[PDB]
Design a protein around this motif. Structure first.
Motif, mmCIF file in Angstrom:
data_model
loop_
_atom_site.group_PDB
_atom_site.id
_atom_site.type_symbol
_atom_site.label_atom_id
_atom_site.label_comp_id
_atom_site.label_asym_id
_atom_site.label_seq_id
_atom_site.Cartn_x
_atom_site.Cartn_y
_atom_site.Cartn_z
ATOM 1 N N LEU A 24 -23.685 -35.159 -5.144
ATOM 2 C CA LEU A 24 -22.845 -35.192 -3.956
ATOM 3 C C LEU A 24 -21.685 -36.166 -4.071
ATOM 4 N N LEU A 25 -21.362 -36.639 -5.274
ATOM 5 C CA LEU A 25 -20.265 -37.591 -5.421
ATOM 6 C C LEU A 25 -18.938 -36.963 -5.014
ATOM 7 N N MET A 26 -18.703 -35.720 -5.422
ATOM 8 C CA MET A 26 -17.443 -35.052 -5.121
ATOM 9 C C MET A 26 -17.493 -34.196 -3.864
ATOM 10 N N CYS A 27 -18.680 -33.873 -3.359
ATOM 11 C CA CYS A 27 -18.805 -33.260 -2.038
ATOM 12 C C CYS A 27 -19.057 -34.347 -0.995
ATOM 13 N N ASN A 28 -18.179 -35.345 -1.014
ATOM 14 C CA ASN A 28 -18.415 -36.594 -0.300
ATOM 15 C C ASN A 28 -18.124 -36.474 1.193
ATOM 16 N N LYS A 29 -16.915 -36.053 1.545
ATOM 17 C CA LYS A 29 -16.454 -36.100 2.925
ATOM 18 C C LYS A 29 -16.930 -34.923 3.761
ATOM 19 N N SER A 30 -17.820 -34.086 3.238
ATOM 20 C CA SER A 30 -18.324 -32.962 4.017
ATOM 21 C C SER A 30 -19.824 -32.755 3.925
ATOM 22 N N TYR A 31 -20.516 -33.374 2.973
ATOM 23 C CA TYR A 31 -21.921 -33.083 2.727
ATOM 24 C C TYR A 31 -22.700 -34.388 2.763
ATOM 25 N N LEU B 100 -14.405 -35.221 6.744
ATOM 26 C CA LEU B 100 -12.984 -34.976 6.530
ATOM 27 C C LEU B 100 -12.330 -34.438 7.795
ATOM 28 N N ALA C 18 -21.006 -44.181 -1.124
ATOM 29 C CA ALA C 18 -20.333 -43.790 0.114
ATOM 30 C C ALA C 18 -20.725 -42.383 0.558
ATOM 31 N N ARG D 264 -22.606 -31.436 6.559
ATOM 32 C CA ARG D 264 -23.571 -30.405 6.214
ATOM 33 C C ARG D 264 -24.724 -31.026 5.443
ATOM 34 N N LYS D 265 -25.936 -30.587 5.756
ATOM 35 C CA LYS D 265 -27.138 -31.182 5.191
ATOM 36 C C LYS D 265 -27.285 -30.849 3.711
ATOM 37 N N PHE D 266 -27.885 -31.772 2.958
ATOM 38 C CA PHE D 266 -28.356 -31.467 1.611
ATOM 39 C C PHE D 266 -29.568 -32.332 1.306
#
Ligand code: MG
Ligand code: MG
Ligand code: MG
Ligand code: MG
Ligand code: MG
Ligand code: MG
Ligand code: MG
Ligand code: MG
Ligand code: MG
Ligand code: MG
Ligand code: MG
Ligand code: MG
Ligand code: MG
Ligand code: MG
Ligand code: MG
Ligand code: MG
Lengths: 128, 62, 19, 124, 216, 225, 51
Positions: A87-94, A6, A118, A74-76
């Motif tokens: 991670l569907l909604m933590c998309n543009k950063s994780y 993002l 994506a 950021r890693k996950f």
RNA sequence: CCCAUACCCGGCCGUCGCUGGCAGUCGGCAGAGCGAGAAAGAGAGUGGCGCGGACGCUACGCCGCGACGAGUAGGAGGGCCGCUGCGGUGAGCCUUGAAGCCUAGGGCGCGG
RNA sequence: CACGGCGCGUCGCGGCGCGCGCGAGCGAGCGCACGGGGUCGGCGGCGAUGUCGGCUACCCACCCGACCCGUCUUGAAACACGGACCAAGGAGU
RNA sequence: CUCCCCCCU
RNA sequence: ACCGCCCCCCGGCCGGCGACCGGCCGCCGCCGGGCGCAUUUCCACCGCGGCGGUGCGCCGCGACCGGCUCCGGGACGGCU
């Protein structure tokens, strides 16, 4: 044309060299892992000039860009497909990383699902 | 360099109950809101006494 | 005039006079 | 109630996963998949969920009903919407807003629906 | 209604007016200037009529979005920046290009352009440089000037004219404009003795001479 | 409904705007009066000295009532008495400064700590510059920079100090509430003296920087702020 | 809030103390008038010396 | 004129203080404020089209202001630092390759 | 000149000060900015088998700094003591 | 949101 | 036998049914099927089109604004 985060701020690190344990160069029995010296005469402990630096809280990175990968994400860690939809909604950063234990048969499925959803994967071709 | 002493810099009073039960913590939430959004100091006193320990909340007889 | 309480009517006076 | 079970489950859930200085929630009707009081899908009486359709295309919207709180079998109503993105989002928005049904999740539900929809579209 | 009059006070210093509040109340004659108290279009369709809603809702919201920015006042786009010019630079002055492909070539200066770049040219008949733009910082302005107050340069040439496109071919318009400018510039510089050779030459630094010592 | 409520909103808004305008006019006129008073005070001493010289006698000016003090020594190795006096004067850091009103108690207190401070009689321009550039207020036990008049007006409204001009005038003339004004004023953090000092250790009379310098404190301030 | 220098920022100084504007206007006008007076007096003195 | 980890200005980390702020996400059933020098009501009353509006809030959370940060012996707190086993839980991983070991590879954390 | 209405004007000392009414404390727009922390609605080059980026980490060079740790001790680099090197075990239960 | 006058394109 | 407490039945109130509802009516929303038939609605492509957001593959430059600093050049005035 990989997926981009993002926002990509300018990551600044106060220090990049590792913190080397005192006298770890002289011996093999002394591992590189940091230990605070506690000797009564230790130059490093007493913070003499031109000696090995000791880690302080002052070197801590800023909270805005802490733990950020150079790509801006950021890693996950993920082990299977089902954890990917987290991670569907933590998309543009994780971004996602496949655990090293995952076999290639499941790795291809996970990477293809991430391609649908994506989510960036930092090791997408780890078994080919 | 500043000519000061840091001995009594940190105050020791309780910020929250040391207890772990959930009913007291819900009461603490409610009275935290009441104390910070009401000018009455009765709520502040009650919330402070909720924070306290058992030996500082002695039983009251009939 | 600058006093919030006693200067209210004087402020009203000058405000109406400006019209 | 609700806050009581939230205090019970805020740190001792099977749906909780904590790693890499993160925390995530897993239970089905949880938009944004994150551990929070608002978005926890099992605590509140009024709950909204958005899932991909069983068929390869469409979006299933799940709404918690008001009567059978202790009857899990007959507690959720599911509606499948299979249309264009704009009308799907409009229908979800109307369902959330004009029903006064947990309005704080309107944008989260819209965002999640949009995503599911994109995922469903063939890749390049 | 009402024709917009000019400001009644000359600027004494930036941000300070010449006349005070009462002097302004008098000059504006305000003692006799007292005062006292879309989104839908109907269309026919061949049915009936439809109320089409322009500005329709988006068909995709992103996973997350950045917030707005705080408001700031002193920041303006480059289009309306105030343009500054060095005092030593006047039309008809000789400049020394310091950084271009034409390093150290003496060049006549004509006009300040709209974006701040200097429109410069030494007649390419002798020093081989066309009509060109050059930043005012990257030139040395020597104290030798000719009189070009009585020459006319076309108004059609501008930054839009000199803006790069997209192999570069010179256009006939470029050629004719260069000829039109140089046909007036050249006789002026030919009047001054030993000036054409000076413009032909190229500036350089030899040992024993230092810019802070030498004057130009 | 609210056909009256809507107009009442803007009625309140207009009332507040008029009040603010009146306050601005008040502080403007007070600043003008303070300028007149300063000019009067400046010319009075000249007039008195001239008349005394004309008569052939001498006119001794009044002893100064206000002094500026700057700490010019570090934290290491300080006698307990000197440390206590410095704490009382609020000089806990090198190149800190503050205003002190003068009397027998202040004279003796400063004499105790002569080797550690450079103090003098500040000028009007020095007071102005110090208040405007380095002046921060102590509001709610917090060091707040004075960027608006309302910050001064709340902390010193009961003493009829309502803006920078009141604060500066009260400090410079040592008013009835000079104690309150000075205490509200946070100690000044001055930069190191540009151009250097003469000699920190010794007294000003013997060529150093410590001790009392009557009006050279203005020269010192010009480079320390 | 970022603290700007009143001694260098004219409108910050005006916000803190409106009368500073009239002070600066008066001193600018006075200095200009004094400079013009001195210049004209010097010119007249030079003319008289030439005479 | 030169420069210390001193002083001034700025950024960042952390600690302490304000026992600071936020449940007001009050939306076509609504009206978007409680920064503003002055202890307290945007007080209630009765008589002379287009259906629309970002983030939030793991309250053990998030956010805002100031000040401060040396340390042996010693005291305390937090460790999503580490090792082994047990009760739960991950419809967890794994012969399409676990543990362990090696690495001039890519990174994270002040550090473990 | 941070002066600007009409009145009833003693709310008054001789007018100025300074009070009571005037649908009753609501005129509006545009625009510029020394105004509660930076923007450009400004641009230029080099890119396929020789070039672009890679803080750190591999090796090497240079300038500055730099005495070997642990321990007892007022005082340790000490002409004080323990220590060739490595692995595993090893001490407030 | 009044009305005039002067100058340069 | 008496008293207290509790369970059950009946009668009368109070409160809740948001840790705990059914029927009727009204309003609203959603879904499935027809009606609708293309100046509406939707899907995909092109423009070196515009606005807004985020960024540039690498290497660079400029402009103005603000904060903090070091320095230079002018001019004015007061005690003298
Ligand atoms: Mg020692
Ligand atoms: Mg410090
Ligand atoms: Mg303590
Ligand atoms: Mg000493
Ligand atoms: Mg210097
Ligand atoms: Mg000494
Ligand atoms: Mg600082
Ligand atoms: Mg410490
Ligand atoms: Mg190795
Ligand atoms: Mg050396
Ligand atoms: Mg020993
Ligand atoms: Mg000892
Ligand atoms: Mg021996
Ligand atoms: Mg021994
Ligand atoms: Mg030995
Ligand atoms: Mg071992």
């Amino acid at each position: 044309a990989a997926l981009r985060p993002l926002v990509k701020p300018k990551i600044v690190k106060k220090r990049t060299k590792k913190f080397i344990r005192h006298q770890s160069d002289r011996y093999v029995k002394i591992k590189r892992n940091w230990r605070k010296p506690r000797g009564i005469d230790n130059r490093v402990r007493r913070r003499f000039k031109g000696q090995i630096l000791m880690p302080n809280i002052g070197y801590g990175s800023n909270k805005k860009t802490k733990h950020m990968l150079p790509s801006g994400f950021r890693k996950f860690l993920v082990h299977n497909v089902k954890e990917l939809e987290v991670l569907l909604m933590c998309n543009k950063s994780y971004c996602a990383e496949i655990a090293h234990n995952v076999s290639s048969k499941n790795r291809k499925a996970i990477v293809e699902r991430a391609a649908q959803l994506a989510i960036r994967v930092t090791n997408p071709n780890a078994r080919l | 360099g500043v000519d000061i002493r840091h001995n009594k810099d940190r105050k020791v009073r309780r910020k929250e109950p040391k207890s772990q039960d959930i009913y007291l913590r819900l009461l603490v939430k409610l009275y935290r809101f009441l104390a910070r959004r009401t000018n009455s100091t009765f709520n502040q006193v009650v919330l402070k006494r909720l924070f306290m320990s058992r030996t500082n909340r002695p039983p009251l007889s009939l | 005039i600058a006093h919030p309480k006693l200067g209210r009517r004087a402020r009203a006076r000058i405000a109406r006079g400006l019209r | 109630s609700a806050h009581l079970q939230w205090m019970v489950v805020r740190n001792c859930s099977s749906f909780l996963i904590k790693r890499n200085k993160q925390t995530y929630s897993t239970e089905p009707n949880n938009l944004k998949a994150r551990n929070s009081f608002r978005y926890n899908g099992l605590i509140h009486r009024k709950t909204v969920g958005v899932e991909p359709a069983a068929d390869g295309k469409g979006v299933v919207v799940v709404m918690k009903r008001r009567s059978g709180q202790r009857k899990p079998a007959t507690s959720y109503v599911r509606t499948t919407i299979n249309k264009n993105a704009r009308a799907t989002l409009s229908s979800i928005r109307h369902m959330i807003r004009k029903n006064k049904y947990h309005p704080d999740l309107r944008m989260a539900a819209i965002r999640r629906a949009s995503a599911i929809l994109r995922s469903q579209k063939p890749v390049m | 209604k009402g024709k917009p009059h000019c400001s009644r006070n000359p600027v004494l210093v930036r941000g300070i007016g010449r006349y005070s509040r009462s002097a302004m109340y008098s000059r504006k004659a305000l003692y006799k200037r007292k005062y006292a108290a879309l989104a839908t279009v109907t269309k026919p369709v061949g049915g009936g009529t439809r109320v089409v809603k322009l500005r329709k809702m988006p068909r995709y919201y992103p996973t997350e979005d950045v917030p707005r920015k705080l408001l700031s006042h002193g920041k303006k786009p480059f289009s309306q920046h105030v343009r500054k010019l060095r005092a030593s630079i006047t039309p008809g002055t000789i400049l020394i290009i310091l950084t271009g492909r034409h390093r150290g070539k003496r060049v006549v200066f004509l006009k300040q352009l709209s974006s701040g770049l200097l429109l410069v040219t030494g007649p390419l008949s002798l020093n081989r440089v066309p009509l060109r733009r050059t930043h005012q910082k990257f030139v040395i302005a020597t104290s030798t000037k000719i009189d070009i107050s009585g020459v006319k340069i076309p108004k059609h040439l501008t930054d839009a004219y000199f803006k790069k496109k997209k192999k570069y071919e010179i256009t006939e318009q470029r050629k004719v404009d260069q000829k039109a400018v140089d046909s007036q510039i050249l006789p002026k510089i030919k009047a001054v003795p030993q000036l054409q050779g000076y413009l032909r030459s190229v500036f350089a630094l030899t040992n024993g001479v230092y810019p802070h010592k030498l004057v130009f | 409904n609210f056909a009256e409520l809507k107009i009442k909103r803007l009625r309140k808004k207009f009332a507040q705007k008029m009040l603010r305008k009146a306050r601005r006019k008040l502080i403007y006129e007070k600043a003008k009066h303070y300028h007149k008073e300063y000019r009067q005070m400046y010319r009075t001493e000249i007039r008195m000295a001239r008349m005394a010289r004309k008569a052939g006698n001498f006119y001794v000016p009044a002893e100064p009532k206000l002094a500026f003090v700057i700490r010019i020594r570090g934290i290491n190795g300080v006698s307990p008495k000197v440390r206590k006096v410095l704490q009382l004067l609020r000089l806990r850091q090198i190149f800190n400064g503050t205003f002190v009103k003068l009397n027998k108690a202040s004279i003796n207190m400063l004499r105790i700590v002569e080797p550690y401070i450079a103090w003098g009689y500040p000028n009007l321009k020095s007071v102005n510059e110090l208040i405007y550039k380095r002046g921060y207020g102590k509001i709610n036990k917090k060091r707040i920079a004075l960027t608006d008049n309302t910050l001064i007006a709340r902390s010193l409204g009961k003493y009829n100090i309502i803006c920078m001009e009141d604060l500066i005038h009260e400090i410079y003339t040592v008013g009835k509430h000079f104690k309150e004004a000075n205490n509200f004023l946070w100690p000044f953090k001055l930069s190191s003296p540009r151009g250097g000092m003469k000699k920190k250790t010794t007294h000003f009379v013997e060529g150093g920087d410590a001790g009392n310098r009557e009006d050279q404190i203005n020269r010192l301030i010009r480079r320390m702020n | 809030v970022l603290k700007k220098n009143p001694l260098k920022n004219l409108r910050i100084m005006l916000k803190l103390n409106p009368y500073a504007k009239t002070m600066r206007r008066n001193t600018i006008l006075r200095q200009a008038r004094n400079h013009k007076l001195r210049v004209e007096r010097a010119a007249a003195a030079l003319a008289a010396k030439s005479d």
